Structure 1
């Protein structure tokens, strides 16, 4: 079947054109299909700037979503909860360098490396502490992939170096999955310029990819890389003008895992507010930011996703002032959470829902109209939930429009079901804007 009009394809190679009708393009460029020609090998398509022309199907890769199934993985040789004996069975015919990683039955929370040395299969314990992996407690690693790169390059103490992986069955190489779905990027074209932020769950760096500024993120404490997979996957499925856009994924076999994202020149919404402040940001600007976030959220709810981590810090601003939700690490379909932003039922119940997201939206608005100030200002972090559950609610910020504050309050009802829908939030923020109840 030919690619329907509107299909997106990423260029695998540079195309210089064979005829005058042809549309040239560079490797990595995004092409939107217009229509297939009389010859299935060529399509009419447009580039980002809109220019149309003919291009070869062979040269482009259809871009599509990737589902982080329970079988999707970056470690063929990883076998999850496999038992010692099982590894012995999986590794029965004595082969030097035949290895496989499994979780640790023996020592809970850690992992175990299993190798076939000399008619025997050695089992080395991999300790997980302070978010790092280590066998000899001399060399540490961020993930099991780097550990395998290492011990494959040299035995470095082990009875033998690793040579051949015992590929678990059902494993789906995420590297070619993201590759075939048009989301794979090349490390050689990425130059990491500087670190924009070193956070608790990941790092973000400004970079240069094929000439354009880009944001690169890596995820901490993710030994199996599943946090990485989960975040990348969901991102390949999100497409809204108020959601930070995924540009691609970078997987170095050594173990460096990165998520390349559009660059947002103005930094987090928190900072933008604090820097420019009250004397610069008018009411329209503040309401405009609220609507931006609200639409992003209505989109997520409409696609059955729960953000679970909505806050001014996780909202970035582009060069021309468009606020976009970012940081989709905790994003999952209707099911640690930041206490000051999370709804009571959410911290207590094991399931999260859009209604908790709405609660967080309420908190975020307060952040917006407070110009970055931190939630629950004069209260100890150990009183919040109990005070809140005892009906406490922050005071409307200084100079906050009463109508805006009522939206906040409406987000803070203790009975989740009574909280507004994101569409109802948009409608009310629009009702406010329409009558200028914010000016």
Structure 2
């Protein structure tokens, strides 16, 4: 449920393009209001996505205040994340990141993903653009209630979605983080021969090794998010 009346929302500024607006709920809480795009996706699927997210509680997954149903265009009322999407934040702050901070960002995403994996929730669109940056550079996974660059071989050829296909996307997300927001890469068939993604300068041999483990051809050969989490934590300690 969590239905919010339109009169309770104050629209301040468009911050993303459906559209994302910086706003206020009850003239108190700073919120990110996501208004539906009239063309893409139905009103019903947009609300169902929010209903799924409101029942998934983890410190590394974005939270919602509620939904605005009354009039078109309908909107989702999210908590406001101070530094916006991860993809943009990595590019704007490029050259100012230490390798330890970039690994910490990957650990944050992996934590949220391990929770979703255990809850049997498949993201389907895991990328740096679908992750948010809050205070103290904390990363939260967004749009988890629902390309080829982030798609695994079984996804771009047979549409076989699983937590192991999300693991492949996480490997590409890891590349985006360590390359500081670089755009990855008929991208399918290029990956079929053996073309991965070049090793980023800030990523160590041990970090790139984990990325390759996410990029195994067979989904059963890729490690689960629960295993990846402890593998990433081992590198940070040593």
The TM-score, its normalising length taken from structure 1, stands at 0.52
Confirm whether residue 251 of structure 1 aligns to residue 54 of structure 2: no
Offset at residue 204 of structure 1 (A): 0.9
Local SS of the residue matching 1:340: coil
8 Å Cα contact 2:167-2:222 kept in structure 1: yes
Higher strand fraction (1 or 2) = 1
Matched residue, 1:340: 149
Matched residue, 1:196: 15
8 Å Cα contact 1:369-1:400 kept in structure 2: yes
Instruction: Give matches, 1:246-395, under 5 Å.
Output: 246-252=64-70, 254-278=71-95, 280-328=96-144, 330=146, 338-376=147-185, 382=186, 384-395=187-198
Local SS of the residue matching 2:32: strand
Local SS of the residue matching 2:135: coil
8 Å Cα contact 1:290-1:365 kept in structure 2: yes
Offset at residue 289 of structure 1 (A): 0.3
C-alpha distance in 2 between matches for 1:185 and 1:316: 23
Local SS of the residue matching 1:289: helix
Of 231, 250, 261, 2:49 maps to 231
Local SS of the residue matching 2:137: coil
Instruction: Give matches, 1:74-223, under 5 Å.
Output: 178=1, 183-198=2-17, 202-210=18-26, 211-220=28-37, 221=39
The size of the alignment, in residue pairs, is: 236
8 Å Cα contact 1:222-1:228 kept in structure 2: no
CA pair 406-223 structure 1, distance change in 2 beyond 3 A: closer
Local SS of the residue matching 1:398: coil
CA pair 266-430 structure 1, distance change in 2 beyond 3 A: same
Local SS of the residue matching 2:188: helix
Offset at residue 228 of structure 1 (A): 1.3
Q: Deviations over 1:267-308 (max 9, x none)?
A: 111111111112x21121111101000001000001000001
Q: Deviations over 1:57-98 (max 9, x none)?
A: xxxxxxxxxxxxxxxxxxxxxxxxxxxxxxxxxxxxxxxxxx
Offset at residue 224 of structure 1 (A): 4.5
8 Å Cα contact 2:156-2:188 kept in structure 1: no
Local SS of the residue matching 1:306: coil
C-alpha distance in 2 between matches for 1:255 and 1:400: 46
The TM-score, its normalising length taken from structure 2, stands at 0.95
Matched residue, 1:417: 220
Runs of 4+ aligned residues of structure 1 deviating over 3 Å after TM superposition are none
Which of structures 1 and 2 has the bigger CA Rg?
1
Matched residue, 1:408: 211
Instruction: Give matches, 1:52-67, under 5 Å.
Output: none
Q: Which runs of 5+ in 1 are unaligned?
A: 1-177, 331-337, 377-381
Offset at residue 434 of structure 1 (A): 1.3
Matched residue, 1:240: 58
Local SS of the residue matching 2:220: helix
Offset at residue 256 of structure 1 (A): 3.0
8 Å Cα contact 2:167-2:223 kept in structure 1: yes
C-alpha distance in 2 between matches for 1:192 and 1:262: 14
Q: Which runs of 5+ in 2 are unaligned?
A: none
Offset at residue 327 of structure 1 (A): 1.8
8 Å Cα contact 2:47-2:67 kept in structure 1: no
Across the aligned residues of Structure 1 and Structure 2, the Cα RMSD in angstroms comes to 1.3
Higher helix fraction (1 or 2) = 2
